[PDB]
């Protein structure tokens, strides 16, 4: 199910415009792009900032795997650590008008095997991991989030960092 | 054997513009990220800029944003650094890096140049000891500390004057190709260690190390002078 009435942004409450985000291409080995976001929200002098993790794909068949640390992992590292949307990746976010708002992946692209778990456990945020696999065909050009935000965890003066993967589908396969 | 070669330096007065090219040559320039470092004179090495195989992805120091540009000719496997409105405290000598990498994991620079001298007229980590003098054939430890824990997201170099760095070793504990057995490299989270056994003579150089995972920027250690003797 999703939460018709749930709405965000990309900054969230970091106050920072896209041309001010960090952005980087995601960790891509063979067929396998992954967002390791264990390190960038990690406390830091100048945060909160905002890590943006650009899943660019134009090949068919990709899987896509996302890591965000869990609370308490690490003592005192990711406290209040918050990630969006709680049902990811069944769940995920779309811009409709100028907002972030949830959408069914597998409505919005058809044909994505999202496997109920991931090495045995469930395929949850709540167990640090998602993965979800592109299917052969894309036929219109798909922009979907997951927010993965540390921004209002404190350690020492420091303060995390606010993660935002972008998952932008190019057409193929047609 | 060199492979990285920097032109386009020199003096230039306050104010002024330079342009720093790099060749590069027996590696396929297209497919790697490239990176540019200084070291000014009596300091460690400082990471200047990246660019990605595609140009996609730049990036820059904040004190050197707006001021330098980083660009990439694949056809003519050459990289430029633009550099305006230059300042004192530019002076440096500028190497030519490549990346082993391009995403959000980060990088090492696994092949490096010798630099070109130019003169102009947040993650900490800690090396110790600062300066160090051993005789050869003897074992040695150096150890590097990190503001934050990096996992083994460290890397260490080694710098004889007036040569191109070399990598010797890889998230914590992994020998590039070349390096002999007796450089070994341990540790993870905030503590790592850079063992060197069997010292020679060649060894007498500064060890840098190198955190990729929580960047921009990329942040070296200020260095350990040893000195073989």
């Known amino acids: 199910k999703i939460d018709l009435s749930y709405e965000t942004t990309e900054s969230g409450d970091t106050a920072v415009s896209e041309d001010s985000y960090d952005k980087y291409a995601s960790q891509n080995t063979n067929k396998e792009y992954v967002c390791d976001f264990t390190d960038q929200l990690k406390p830091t002098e100048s945060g909160p900032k905002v890590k943006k993790c650009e899943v660019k794909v134009n090949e068919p068949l990709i899987k896509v795997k996302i890591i965000c640390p869990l609370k308490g992992s690490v003592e005192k590292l990711y406290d209040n650590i918050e990630y969006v949307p709680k049902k990811s990746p069944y769940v995920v976010l779309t811009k409709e008008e100028t907002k972030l708002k949830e959408k069914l992946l597998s409505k919005l692209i058809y044909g994505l095997l999202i496997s109920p778990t991931v090495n045995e456990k469930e395929n949850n945020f709540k167990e640090g991991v998602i993965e979800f696999t592109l299917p052969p065909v894309v036929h219109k050009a798909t922009v979907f989030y997951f927010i993965c935000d540390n921004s209002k965890t404190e350690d020492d003066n420091k303060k995390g960092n606010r993660g935002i993967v972008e998952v932008y589908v190019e057409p193929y396969g047609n | 054997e060199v492979q990285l070669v920097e032109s386009g330096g020199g003096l230039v007065k306050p104010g002024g513009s330079l342009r720093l090219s790099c060749a590069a040559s027996?590696?396929?320039?297209?497919?790697?990220?490239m990176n540019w470092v200084r070291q000014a004179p009596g300091k460690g090495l400082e990471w200047v800029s990246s660019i990605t195989s595609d140009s996609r992805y730049i990036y820059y120091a904040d004190s050197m944003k707006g001021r330098f540009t980083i660009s990439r000719d694949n056809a003519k496997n050459s990289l430029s650094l633009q550099m305006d409105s230059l300042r004192v405290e530019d002076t440096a000598i500028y190497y030519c890096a490549r990346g082993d990498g391009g995403g959000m994991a980060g990088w090492y620079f696994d092949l490096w140049g010798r630099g070109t001298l130019v003169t102009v007229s947040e993650i900490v980590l800690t090396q110790s000891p600062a300066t160090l003098s051993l005789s050869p054939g003897e074992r040695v430890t150096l150890s590097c500390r990190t503001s934050?824990?990096?996992?083994?997201?460290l890397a260490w170099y080694q710098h004889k004057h007036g040569q191109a760095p070399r990598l010797l070793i890889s998230?914590?504990?992994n020998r590039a190709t070349g390096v002999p057995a007796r450089f070994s490299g341990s540790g993870s989270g905030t503590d790592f260690t850079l063992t060197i056994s069997n010292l020679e003579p060649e060894d007498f150089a500064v060890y840098y190390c190198?955190?990729?995972?929580?960047?921009?920027?990329?942040?070296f250690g200020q260095g350990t002078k040893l000195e073989i003797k």
């Open positions: 190198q955190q990729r995972s929580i960047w921009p920027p990329f942040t």
């Open positions: 934050q824990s990096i996992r083994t997201n």
């Open positions: 998230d914590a504990s």
């Open positions: 027996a590696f396929t320039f297209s497919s790697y990220t």
